[PDB]
A paper describes a structure:
Two separate GT modules in [name] transfer 3-deoxy-β-d-manno-oct-2-ulosonic acid (β-Kdo) from cytidine-5′-monophospho-β-Kdo donor to a glycolipid acceptor. The N-terminal and C-terminal modules add alternating Kdo residues with β-(2→4) and β-(2→7) linkages, respectively, generating a conserved oligosaccharide core that is further glycosylated to produce diverse capsule structures.
However, as both a worse nucleophile and a worse leaving group, we rationalized that the resulting Kdo–Asn160 adduct would be significantly more recalcitrant to hydrolysis, allowing this intermediate species to accumulate. To determine the structure of the observed [name]-NEc Kdo adduct, crystals of [name]-NEc [name] were grown in the presence of 1 mM CMP before being briefly soaked in a CMP-Kdo–generating reaction mixture and then immediately frozen. In the resulting map, clear density was visible for the CMP nucleotide, which refined to an occupancy of 0.95. Additional density was associated with Asn160; this density was modeled as an α-Kdo adduct and refined to a final occupancy of 0.76, with atomic displacement parameters (B-factors) similar to surrounding residues. Finally, a less defined density peak stacked on Trp42 was modeled as a Kdo residue with partial occupancy (0.78). The α-Kdo adduct is stabilized in the active site by an extensive network of hydrogen bond interactions, mediated by a series of highly conserved residues. The observed binding mode places the exocyclic O7 and O8 nearest the CMP phosphate group, while the anomeric carbon is positioned 5.4 Å away. Nevertheless, the distance between the anomeric carbon and the CMP phosphate suggests that the adduct undergoes significant structural rearrangement after transfer of Kdo from CMP.
Author numbering: 1 to 142, 147 to 320
């Protein structure tokens, strides 16, 4: 029932197990069939624009896909298939300009309360089992007052649609340095940049004695254990820091900002917080990791759950 134009999407292994619905390939060169009840695209990739306009003009709704928050062993830039996808029938999680399906799941508190025991169980497995979106980095080993500043991939869609850009990165690091005069500043490069497939926002940062550059691929939770507080623009690292029990200052508008849990600096923070309301950490985790994300079994490709994928990711 769902039409897909993107060959890249069409090509995702076990895609049909993620969508839980029949899917069919559509061509831009002919009308959308009436049978199609929705059109699915990848986030806001440039390829999504033409299918979005088509769907609008035929009155069909758009579904936006993206990788899950526990995705795979190696990076997507290296061609590793995903073990989790998100499926968003309202917007997409990283677009702060309007509600996403994730935002409405967070606000459905009753539905998150029903999952609190699974959420606590999975949260513990992630923090003490040292898990993250990617899971091939080795644990970190090595002053005690450390401020973590998180770099990202240049022009990533979670920055642009989270109302940020190069300025918020410069402002983030100047704020980190100025608000913690005696702390040591640690700038973590994104693994895609370390893989040489992307560039960072601090490409031309000059390191000092107080500003140390961490250009090593290390697992988030292990590095977080040595940090006092975290500064982000929009990175998923920010939510993982909250799971580690660390304070988080946000300079863009990611999916986990403006719920009452983060020190939000974006100029439109008050507007977004008014729309979102309040939420607990466990509500956010249940909504995002258990309800918004879908999983497949890594050995069979059949529909699965977070716990099965966490288990299979942990022995490697
Ligand atoms: N500076 C950074 C930024 C991201 N990452 C990794 O990349 C994942 C995704 O983060 P992004 O939203 O920044 O793409 C994180 O969960 C984390 O595993 C990292 O290890 N160091
Ligand atoms: O259409 C896509 O977006 C694509 O083919 C390219 C990348 O998004 C890449 O992540 C790929 C993965 O197979 C999905 O994670 O999907
Ligand atoms: O694909 C992007 O544009 C970006 C979106 C972010 O939410 C995040 O998925 C990021 C990846 O984590 C980069 O590896 O890609
Ligand atoms: Cl369980």
């Amino acid at each position: 029932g769902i039409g897909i134009y993107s060959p890249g999407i069409w090509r995702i292994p076990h895609l049909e197990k993620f969508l839980a619905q029949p899917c069919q390939k559509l061509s831009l060169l002919r009308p959308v069939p009436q049978e199609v009840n929705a059109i699915a695209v990848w986030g806001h990739r440039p390829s999504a624009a033409k299918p979005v306009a088509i769907a609008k003009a035929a009155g069909k709704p758009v579904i936006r896909l993206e990788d899950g928050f526990v995705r795979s062993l190696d990076l997507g830039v290296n061609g590793e298939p995903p073990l989790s996808l998100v499926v968003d029938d309202c917007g997409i999680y990283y677009d702060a300009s309007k509600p996403s399906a994730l935002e409405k799941l967070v606000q459905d508190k009753a539905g998150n309360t029903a999952l609190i025991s699974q959420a606590r169980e999975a949260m513990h497995t992630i923090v003490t089992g040292d898990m993250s979106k990617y899971n091939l980095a080795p644990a970190f080993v090595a002053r005690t007052n450390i401020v973590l500043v998180v770099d990202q991939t240049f022009n990533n869609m979670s920055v642009t649609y989270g109302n940020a850009g190069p300025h918020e990165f410069a402002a983030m690091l100047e704020a980190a340095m100025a608000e913690n005069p005696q702390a040591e500043i640690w700038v973590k490069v994104h693994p895609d940049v370390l893989e040489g497939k992307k560039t960072g926002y601090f490409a031309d940062l000059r390191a000092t004695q107080r500003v140390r550059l961490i250009a090593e691929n290390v697992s988030p939770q292990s590095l977080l254990r040595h940090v006092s507080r975290v500064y982000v623009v929009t990175s998923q690292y920010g939510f993982e820091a909250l799971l580690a029990g660390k304070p988080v200052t946000c300079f863009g508008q990611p999916w986990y900002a403006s719920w009452g849990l983060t020190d939000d600096r974006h100029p439109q923070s008050a507007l977004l917080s008014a729309r979102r309301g309040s939420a607990t950490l466990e509500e956010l985790f249940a909504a995002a990791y258990l309800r918004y994300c879908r999983y497949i079994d890594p050995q069979t490709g059949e529909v699965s759950d977070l716990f099965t994928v966490l288990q299979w990711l942990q022995l490697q």
